[PDB]
Amino acid sequence: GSSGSSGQALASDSEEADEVPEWLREGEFVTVGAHKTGVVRYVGPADFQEGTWVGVELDLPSGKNDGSIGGKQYFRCNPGYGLLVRPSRVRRATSGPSSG
Numbered sequence: 001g002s003s004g005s006s007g008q009a010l011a012s013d014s015e016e017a018d019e020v021p022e023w024l025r026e027g028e029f030v031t032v033g034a035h036k037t038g039v040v041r042y043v044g045p046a047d048f049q050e051g052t053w054v055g056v057e058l059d060l061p062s063g064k065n066d067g068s069i070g071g072k073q074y075f076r077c078n079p080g081y082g083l084l085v086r087p088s089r090v091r092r093a094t095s096g097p098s099s100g
Contacts, residue, residue: 018051029093041075055084
């Protein structure tokens with residue numbers, strides 16, 4: 001068993017945490033694994049859960065929390081157009097190569 005490519009690249013595979021990227025911030029376009037795209041509206045820890053959370057606004061109806069969760073609110077826009085996921089569930093999009 002030997003393919004064309006070969007070699008190791010030890011980088012990150014020991015300390016797995018919820019590190020919050022630098023690009024992550026309010027007014028920043030991003031995408032999710034299974035939650036479509038959405039702009040960041042909130043970025044900070046929670047009260048019910050530990051770690052760091054990221055409020056992503058979904059232009060389309062497919063979220064869970066209508067701006068607030070378990071009482072406490074973070075962002076308000078419309079019922080059925082809000083969601084809050086961890087940084088791990090958020091990636092940079094930077095869409096708009098030519099058009100907008």
